[PDB]
Amino acid sequence: VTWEEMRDKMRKWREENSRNSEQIVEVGEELINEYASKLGDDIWIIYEQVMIAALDYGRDDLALFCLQELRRQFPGSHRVKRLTGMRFEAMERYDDAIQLYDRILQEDPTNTAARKRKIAIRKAQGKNVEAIRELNEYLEQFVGDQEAWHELAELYINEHDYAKAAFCLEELMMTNPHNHLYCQQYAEVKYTQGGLENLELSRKYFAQALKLNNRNMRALFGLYMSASHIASNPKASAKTKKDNMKYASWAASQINRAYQFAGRSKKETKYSLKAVEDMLE
Amino acid sequence: GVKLTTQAYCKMVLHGAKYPHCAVNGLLVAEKHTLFVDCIPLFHGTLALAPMLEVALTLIDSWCKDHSYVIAGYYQANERVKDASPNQVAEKVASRIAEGFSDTALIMVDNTKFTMDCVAPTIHVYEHHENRWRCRDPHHDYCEDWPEAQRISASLLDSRSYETLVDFDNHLDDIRNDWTNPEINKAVLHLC
């Protein structure tokens, strides 16, 4: 347990957007308290996360410390300005944060952080419709922002506009053809959206996600259930009926295999057996 | 008339603490004033997706009827602090689970009252009558042993057991993670 090890863990925990605020804030505090001088400026980005985790963790005591250090180090910095805005938002102080973000925008118009933080404020305030409108307007100048694109898709799903969510997921997949998560999510959205005209898309995209990752057993039984629903649907043609029945049977075989592997891996009660008892039904 | 066990309340707090930033949901199973003997969590964050909910409900029904229980309640903790009303997802899920047994009523973890020790009952129980869902009396007793629920929730949270808690979503990630989460059950037994 050396500071390099926790440093690497924090770097990884930053590389992938995790939200275990407790663990990351503890590790960052240990690094900046014990091994602050053991490494150079690489803790400075940590000083960001440490406060954000704090704002997520509610422990605001060290948020002021990190903010003051960053501000005293980086005067007149847009990054530190957005960070102060988040600090303000930590206590639902929205007017001052909005004013700060507006000042950042008038100081720099191409900045996207201010727009994201202000729409985050709007969605924290519960104005979901205006948040969707703000994201649509912001994208109109910044088409291609995957994070905002996915956020708008999630907001539409929460608000239940599966058509717009499906469209956003389609363009997101356009951005990332190789991400099986987008394919699985779009298949789910299309299945939730409607019937056979979307059940076919859901099963096709579930198969694509499985192709992109064989371990995505979530999407596996999602394809299984989509095929089963298509089979149960009277509107399925005879050839479509047998095709989706074959898909469901193959998916069920894969599910039994997957649960058998889940069985051989662990040593406990045969819940996997009960699971395939469900599938056989 | 909705009654849930203390282990149900501690599971409520455990799942709320596990994903404090993300709205969560799940079901409560009981044997055939219904007493929710056990609970089970499922998913978090995005909750409006149907396929996961359907596959879940199917697995819940299979697991419960295999072990003599039947699903008889639905729980949901919202993401927003100032949100305590059911959404469309919660309403439809509660209606569908209540379609089997009329005694099934929805419960929502009011995150506004979510604290370390859970001083006040966070869960609010909503009944379906007149084709509408409305809350019961907040002043009603919800847990079977309120001081026991308070102490066990405080001990479990202070013991960092929320990180160890596993819901259906982790099972979806990997079946090796036990979705039946008997670990929290044995912790409850030891604490009690």
Partner: peptide, 26 residues
């Protein structure tokens, strides 16, 4: 299917790039 729950219903400017009408242009 005993759990065929429907989650559609109310759909609530439009997201940029979106066009609701199904056009057969090809």
């Amino acid at each position: 299917f005993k759990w065929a729950i429907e989650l559609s219903g109310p759909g609530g400017l439009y997201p940029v790039g979106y066009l609701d009408k199904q056009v057969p242009d090809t």
